[PDB]
Design a protein around this ligand. Structure first.
Ligand SMILES: *[C@@H]1O[C@H](CO)[C@@H](O)[C@H](O)[C@H]1NC(C)=O
Ligand SMILES: *[C@@H]1O[C@H](CO)[C@@H](O)[C@H](O)[C@H]1NC(C)=O
Ligand SMILES: *[C@@H]1O[C@H](CO)[C@@H](O)[C@H](O)[C@H]1NC(C)=O
Ligand SMILES: *[C@@H]1O[C@H](CO)[C@@H](O)[C@H](O)[C@H]1NC(C)=O
Ligand SMILES: *[C@@H]1O[C@H](CO)[C@@H](O)[C@H](O)[C@H]1NC(C)=O
Ligand SMILES: *[C@@H]1O[C@H](CO)[C@@H](O)[C@H](O)[C@H]1NC(C)=O
Ligand SMILES: *[C@@H]1O[C@H](CO)[C@@H](O)[C@H](O)[C@H]1NC(C)=O
Ligand SMILES: *[C@@H]1O[C@H](CO)[C@@H](O)[C@H](O)[C@H]1NC(C)=O
Ligand SMILES: *[C@@H]1O[C@H](CO)[C@@H](O)[C@H](O)[C@H]1NC(C)=O
Ligand SMILES: *[C@@H]1O[C@H](CO)[C@@H](O)[C@H](O)[C@H]1NC(C)=O
Lengths: 407, 234, 317, 147, 49
């Protein structure tokens, strides 16, 4: 690695930095609140009785969790079709309005509830837009919406002057003028009533049994998308650097226990350097500190390929408790060398007053010696007078000029 | 009247924690030593109150004098307006499109003629009894900050803590207070219902985009905040 | 870390970073060169002596008092009261920014300072020009007074007065270094510059440099990969420029520190390890001797100066 | 300029020019810093040449470690090597020292050197070489009594 | 002054300039430091007496 970093084959003696040590996260936990609200789908699917098709009700949902889990409500659906939105991908989408329309029609009339259809229910009772984005759920309800004597409680409009607009509701009961005179508002020849009854019976055929059909209208009006389904629910890893996604706040690190108290409304937390070091868990009220795990830099201490090939590793600025004689110093932690107790001359600088060398055998590590020890006898009546002279030569090399270059 | 807001109008700029540090932020704050309007002797006109950069509402009501607030565009037909009513144990915030009179009163129960909306937002009821409120509207969020501190406006320091958020975007340009009395007045045109009651006074002060330097202590509570465009030392 | 500071735990960001060139292997190289150069400036001034000298047990040099400059064996850290006072006045891994500790700690520099003090007190100036020669302190002071032209009689007769003046000066050194905290600024402001250099990089990471967001997790989740590549490229360019300007400032400050360290080593060699005839290179006035004291990021020289006073008018020919 | 048309490849050339200018400005800055360093080194070398080769200086370690006598320069393709001749004392010996000598009621001090004693004897010497000489009036001066 | 050198009589330009960061904050600080240092060099040679 040192040869690749220096781009050579015969490295010299010393310490060289090659790369950095990083601990990869094992898991990735996400924590959101358990539940705040929920769409009342138990009311629009498990009601005691639904309304007619000419007077269909519409319930607005704007402050609830859009949890699409219709599977537990009569899972053997007879007609489960989706328009514009995928069936399974709908659970991970946000919208503006979650208007839900419900009505009861015949078995052979469920096909008319679709974008671009022609018939009595589609044109005179309930019309869907062409570019409709939603889902249509229909299930059999013969046991509930039919009696032996005839369930004439559900009515439908059969005659009307013109077709209904998409998402239009009309409850008018005016006598339809089929002839030339308005009949002055009486029932007679060419004066027919618009609403007709069904009279569901349990002995009817599959095409005539009542089918509770519900329409989930979806639309996006560039709103903050208050409605949203469930996100996730995981545990809390301790003493290990993992990936946290707390309420959109994403990061990687260790979540350790702390003792500082926060405010009831404060959830996040930053230091003076604008670094996220504290975040409140959405599951339970408890603050934890964000501290990174083992992180630093690796350095190879080599005596040079001319002598031998045994090298030593040094992790700088990181404790080596977590992930060959291991020894902890003040400037880092070195492996591959043994700490000697006799101080010699410093050869390879490491830091904090520790230097490595080759004993001649293996890499050593010793506290650098500042020199020898010599204490002169200081006396008020003694002196040291020289006797001999020595003429020595001292070399002092200093650069003068440089390489004149131009581009 | 007109009073001087010496050192009040500060709030938390974000839901972050800090420990004995300094934070300089350019937000929409109330300038210190500003000339606010004190409407204390107006015991039921002037219903034109803008909502350009927010509202700083200071109150010293004894007990349950103010019943709520109104925030609309023009208070006319087909106008998105939010009415907030604070009862004894429940609070309601309803946004709808309806016309309002000159002074909607409560004692009453039905302000306008018809209110056909299906909005739902229920939270904890809000209402030496100083009560400060800061109302802003930004990024489709109608943010409100409330604080109940003892004691008109003294030289103390008290921040505004955010409690609830409401995602809604409306070009609000109106502001109306809701007074509570005893006598009945059903006529919307007659704007004369002065009755002897406790002290009623609603301060009005407009916010401004300014830079504030706040000091967060070890507990994470705003204990000092200075402006940058009122003094050379600041 | 040129890979971690620009790219925050991202693989494709690191794959795109190598397209700029060899800047990651150049800025880190310049930084480690600056570190090695700073590791050498500490050995050109404090490590001038070859052998460590010690103080004799008899605390009687002739009448002078060196208790404030000699190390005190009572305290755990073997330093002088002046060094302990100076140490209590210098106020001292985030996003891939580490601080490498120096080789010579505060203990080895203290040992070098004590050795230099012992050499300049017991041996005089012979410890810095060859073998150490024993010599009494009053005779060394007589040599230093004769080197500037003053006869040795004024010292061999009026010795108690000079000793009392030196003791009073050593005592008032601490009182003068206690007040006016702005004196120890040259050792702090540069450190403050580090506080304005190591923290200014993380402060600029919050800026989007024109992009939609500052963190990569939002860009790689909101925008599409093919169209968000320009935003990542602009962020990498901005971070590279913000790191290059920091490297340039560090190079300039390292050159300044090298010049200051060369000047300090020259003063240590020409004032402590001998007496110089220069005017104000070893303090204003007539220089006699100099005592060095260590500091976590510098050296304090105390120069003894002989100043004439109480002059009188006379006739000359 | 061959794969894409100039009107559609202008931003690429602009970005290339910007990157190359940014890479060259850093080189220019490094060259300026290194030129300042070399200028300081050359000024120091010229000062040492003037104060060590063209005369003798009284500085301690500016013209070599020890007592400087002379200096010889030697050229090199990118620098200069100074060979400093240093006189170093050695083979020192212990002797007894005294400030002055009190005789005839007067305290005499030496002019050059000091008084060395090796046992029931006293001589005058210098501060750099042992030369025992009898205490005479030429190398001594009276400056009062030994009171 | 970067606010005037980079943005000539423009408010949106000044708003977008702060988005870059604290480059001007350190640039003007270095300029003031250079000014103070040049004001100090005249007192170390002429103001010795
Ligand atoms: C979520 O459930 C846990 C376990 O019962 C509970 O401790 C916590 O308070 C719940 N969250 C909220 C917001 O109530
Ligand atoms: C090998 O070469 C290195 C390079 O400087 C040198 O330091 C070392 O002494 C050499 N070893 C031998 C055994 O020649
Ligand atoms: C590293 O961890 C060990 C284990 O507790 C500890 O004894 C040692 O002091 C640590 N090193 C540093 C520099 O804190
Ligand atoms: C140094 O001393 C320690 C403790 O006395 C011992 O554990 C270690 O083995 C010694 N090292 C060598 C190289 O002997
Ligand atoms: C506030 O404004 C009113 C009228 O706008 C004025 O009469 C009053 O003096 C002002 N107060 C201060 C403190 O300037
Ligand atoms: C009005 O206040 C009463 C308590 O006096 C409370 O029971 C009721 O729920 C409140 N009404 C609303 C709409 O908040
Ligand atoms: C030297 O001074 C210190 C205090 O400055 C004092 O405690 C000590 O006794 C003095 N020693 C002598 C020999 O005067
Ligand atoms: C010498 O005399 C002058 C006036 O003739 C006077 O100003 C000066 O102070 C005198 N010198 C001293 C040392 O007093
Ligand atoms: C002088 O004497 C001391 C001890 O009395 C001794 O350590 C020293 O070596 C002697 N000097 C010489 C030059 O031998
Ligand atoms: C001292 O040195 C002198 C040199 O002139 C010599 O004559 C004398 O004998 C010596 N005395 C002793 C005791 O060595």
């Amino acid at each position: 690695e040192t040869k690749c970093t220096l781009k050579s084959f015969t490295v010299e003696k010393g310490i060289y930095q090659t790369s950095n040590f990083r601990v990869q996260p094992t898991e990735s936990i996400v924590r959101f609140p358990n539940i705040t609200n929920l769409c009342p789908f138990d009311e629009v699917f498990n009601a005691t009785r639904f309304a007619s098709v000419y007077a269909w009700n519409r319930k607005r949902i704007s402050n609830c969790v859009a949890d699409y889990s219709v599977l537990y409500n009569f899972a053997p659906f007879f007609a489960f079709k989706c328009y514009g939105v995928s069936p399974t991908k709908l659970n991970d989408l946000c919208f503006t309005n979650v208007y839900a329309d419900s009505f009861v029609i015949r078995g052979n009339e469920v096909s008319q509830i679709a974008p671009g259809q022609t018939g009595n229910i589609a044109d005179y009772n309930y019309k869907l837009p062409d570019d409709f984005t939603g889902c249509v759920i229909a299930w059999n309800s013969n046991k509930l919406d039919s009696k032996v004597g005839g369930n004439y409680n559900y009515l439908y409009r059969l005659f009307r002057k013109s077709n209904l607009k998409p998402f239009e509701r009309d409850i008018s009961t005016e006598i339809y003028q089929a002839g030339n005179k308005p009949c002055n508002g009486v029932a007679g020849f060419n004066c027919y009533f618009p609403l007709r009854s069904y009279g569901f019976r349990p002995t009817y055929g599959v095409g005539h049994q009542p089918y509770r059909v519900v329409v989930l209208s979806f639309e996006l009006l560039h709103a903050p998308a208050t409605v949203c389904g469930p996100k996730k629910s995981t545990n809390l890893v301790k003493n290990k650097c993992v990936n946290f996604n707390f309420n959109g706040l994403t990061g990687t690190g260790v979540l350790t226990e702390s003792n500082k108290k926060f405010l009831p409304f404060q959830q996040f937390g930053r230091d003076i350097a604008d670094t996220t070091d504290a975040v409140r868990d959405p599951q339970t009220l408890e603050i934890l500190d964000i501290t990174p795990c083992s992180f630093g830099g690796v350095s190879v201490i080599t005596p040079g390929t001319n002598t031998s090939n045994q090298v030593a590793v040094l992790y700088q600025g990181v404790n080596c408790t977590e992930v060959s004689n291991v020894f902890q110093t003040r400037a880092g932690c070195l492996i591959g060398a043994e700490y000697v107790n006799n101080s010699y001359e410093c050869d390879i600088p490491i830091g904090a007053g520790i230097c490595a060398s080759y004993q001649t055998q293996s890499i050593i590590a010793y506290t650098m010696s500042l020199g020898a020890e010599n204490s002169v006898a200081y006396s008020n009546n003694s002196i040291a007078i020289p006797t001999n002279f020595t003429i020595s030569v001292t070399t002092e090399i200093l650069p003068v000029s440089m390489t004149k270059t131009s581009v | 009247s007109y009073t001087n807001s010496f050192t009040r109008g500060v709030y938390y700029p974000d839901k972050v924690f800090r420990s004995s540090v300094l934070h300089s932020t350019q937000d929409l704050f109330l300038p210190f030593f500003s000339n606010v309007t004190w409407f204390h002797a107006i015991h039921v006109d002037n219903p034109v109150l803008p909502f350009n950069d927010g509202v700083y509402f200071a109150s010293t009501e004894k007990s349950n004098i103010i019943r709520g607030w109104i925030f609309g565009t023009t208070l006319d037909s087909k106008t998105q307006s939010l009415l907030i009513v604070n009862n004894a144990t429940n609070v309601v915030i309803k946004v709808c499109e309806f016309q309002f009179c000159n002074d909607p009163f409560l004692d009453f129960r039905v302000y306008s003629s018809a209110n056909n909306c299906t909005f739902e937002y229920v939270s904890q009821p809000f209402l030496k009894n100083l009560r400060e409120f800061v109302f802003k509207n930004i990024d489709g969020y109608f943010k409100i900050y409330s604080k109940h501190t003892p004691i008109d406006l003294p030289q103390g320091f008290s921040a505004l803590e955010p409690l609830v958020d409401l995602p809604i975007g409306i070009n609000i340009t109106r502001f109306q207070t809701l007074l509570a009395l005893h006598r009945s007045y059903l006529t919307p045109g007659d704007s004369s219902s002065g009755w002897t009651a406790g002290a009623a006074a609603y301060y009005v002060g407009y916010l401004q985009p300014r830079t504030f330097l706040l000091k967060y202590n070890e507990n994470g509570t705003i204990t000092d905040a200075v402006d940058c465009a009122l003094d050379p030392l600041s | 870390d040129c890979t971690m500071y620009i790219c925050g735990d991202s693989t494709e960001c690191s794959n795109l970073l190598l397209q700029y060139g060899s800047f990651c292997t150049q800025l880190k190289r310049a930084l480690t060169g600056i570190a090695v150069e700073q590791d050498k400036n500490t050995q050109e001034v404090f490590a001038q002596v070859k052998q460590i000298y010690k103080t004799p047990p008899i605390k009687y040099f002739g009448g002078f008092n060196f208790s404030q400059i000699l190390p005190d064996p009572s305290k755990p850290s073997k330093r002088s009261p002046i060094e302990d006072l100076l140490f209590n006045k210098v106020t001292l891994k985030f996003n891939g920014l580490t601080v490498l500790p120096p080789l010579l700690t505060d203990e080895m520099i203290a040992q070098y300072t004590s050795a230099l003090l012992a050499g300049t007190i017991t041996s005089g100036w012979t410890f810095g020009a060859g073998p150490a020669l024993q010599i009494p302190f009053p005779m060394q002071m007589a040599y230093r007074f004769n080197g500037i032209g003053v006869t040795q009689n004024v010292l061999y007769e009026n010795q108690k007065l000079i000793a009392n003046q030196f003791n009073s000066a050593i005592g008032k050194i601490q009182d003068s270094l206690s007040s006016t905290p702005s004196a120890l600024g040259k050792l702090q402001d540069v450190v403050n510059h580090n506080a304005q250099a190591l923290n200014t990089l993380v402060k600029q990471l919050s800026s989007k440099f024109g992009a939609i967001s500052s963190v990569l997790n939002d860009i790689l989740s909101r925008l599409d990969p093919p169209e968000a590549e320009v935003q990542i490229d602009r962020l990498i360019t901005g971070r590279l420029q913000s790191l290059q300007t920091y490297v340039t400032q560090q190079l300039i400050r390292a050159a300044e520190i090298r010049a200051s360290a060369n000047l300090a080593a020259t003063k240590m060699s020409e004032c402590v390890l001998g007496q110089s005839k220069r005017v104000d290179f070893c303090g204003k006035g007539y220089h006699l001797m100099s005592f060095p004291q260590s500091a976590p990021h510098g050296v304090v020289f105390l120069h003894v100066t002989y100043v004439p006073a109480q002059e009188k008018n006379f006739t000359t020919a | 300029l061959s794969r894409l048309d100039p009107p559609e490849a202008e931003v690429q050339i602009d970005r290339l020019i910007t990157g190359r200018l940014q890479s060259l400005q850093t080189y220019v800055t490094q060259q300026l810093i290194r030129a300042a360093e070399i200028r300081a080194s050359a000024n120091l070398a010229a000062t040492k040449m003037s104060e060590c080769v063209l005369g003798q200086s009284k500085r301690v370690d500016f013209c070599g470690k020890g007592y400087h006598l002379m200096s010889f320069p030697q050229s090199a393709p990118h620098g200069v090597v100074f060979l400093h001749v240093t006189y170093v004392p050695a083979q020192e010996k212990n002797f007894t020292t005294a400030p002055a000598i009190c005789h005839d009621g007067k305290a005499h001090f030496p002019r050059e050197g000091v008084f060395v004693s090796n046992g029931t004897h006293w001589f005058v010497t210098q501060r750099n070489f042992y030369e025992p000489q009898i205490i005479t009036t030429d190398n001594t001066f009276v400056s009062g009594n030994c009171d």
